[PDB]
Amino acid sequence: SLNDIEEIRFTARSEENLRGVHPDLVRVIRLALRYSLVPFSVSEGLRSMARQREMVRAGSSQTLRSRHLTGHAVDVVAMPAGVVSWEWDYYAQIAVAVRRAARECGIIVEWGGEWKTLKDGPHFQLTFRDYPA
Ligand SMILES: [Cl-]
Ligand SMILES: [Zn+2]
C-alpha cells in the first residue's frame, strides 16, 4: 500500500479533523505536518459538550471547561508507516515539529508532554492567556 509513497504524510485525514478548530491552531498544525519526521493525524479537534460531560462522569477530566470545546486544542495520533502508535518518542518528535511551526507563526502552543504531571503526548492547545475563551 505505502511502498511507493516516498514521504508519508496524513494531510487529508488531518485537515478533515481540523474543521472547526481555531484557524491559528490549524495553521500551526498544517505547518507541523510538513516538518515532522513522524507522520500523524489529528484524532480529535472539536469535542462536543456531551463527550466532555462523559469524561467528567468517568473521571478522565475534572472540569467541563476544555480547550477542545471551543476549538483551541487538538489531540494528534502518530501514524508511523501508516500504523497507529501510542509510543512516547513519536509524540516527542511530533512536538518538535509543532514547536517549530508555532515559533514560525508567532504563537505559543502548549503540549501535554510538558504538563506538570501526568504528561501525555497527543494534546496540543492554544494558551488561555493568548486566546481567552
Ligand atoms: Cl520554541
Ligand atoms: Zn486533548
Numbering used by the authors: 2 to 134
What's in the article?
The high-resolution crystal structure of S. marcescens ChiX reveals that the protein belongs to the lysostaphin-type, d-Ala d-Ala metallopeptidases and sonic hedgehog ‘LAS’ family of Zn2+-dependent peptidases. In vitro assays then establish ChiX as an l-Ala d-Glu endopeptidase that cleaves the cross-links in bacterial peptidoglycan, and site-directed mutagenesis is used to demonstrate that the chitinase secretion controlled by ChiX is directly attributable to this catalytic activity.
On the other side, and linking β1 and β2, α3 and a short α4 form a helical loop. The Zn2+-binding site is at the base of this cleft and is primarily created by residues from one side of the β-sheet. The cation displays tetrahedral co-ordination geometry typical of many Zn2+-dependent enzymes involving two nitrogen and two oxygen atoms. Two histidines, His68 contributed from α4 and His123 from β4, co-ordinate the metal through NE2 and ND1, respectively. The third co-ordinating group is Asp75 OE1 and the fourth is provided by Glu7 OE2 from the N-terminal tail of another ChiX molecule (molecule B) in the asymmetric unit. This difference in conformation is potentially due to the salt bridge formed between Asp120 and Arg34 of the adjacent ChiX molecule in the asymmetric unit and further compounded by the presence of Glu7 also from the adjacent molecule, which forms the fourth co-ordination point with the Zn2+ and would prevent Asp120 moving closer due to electrostatic repulsion.
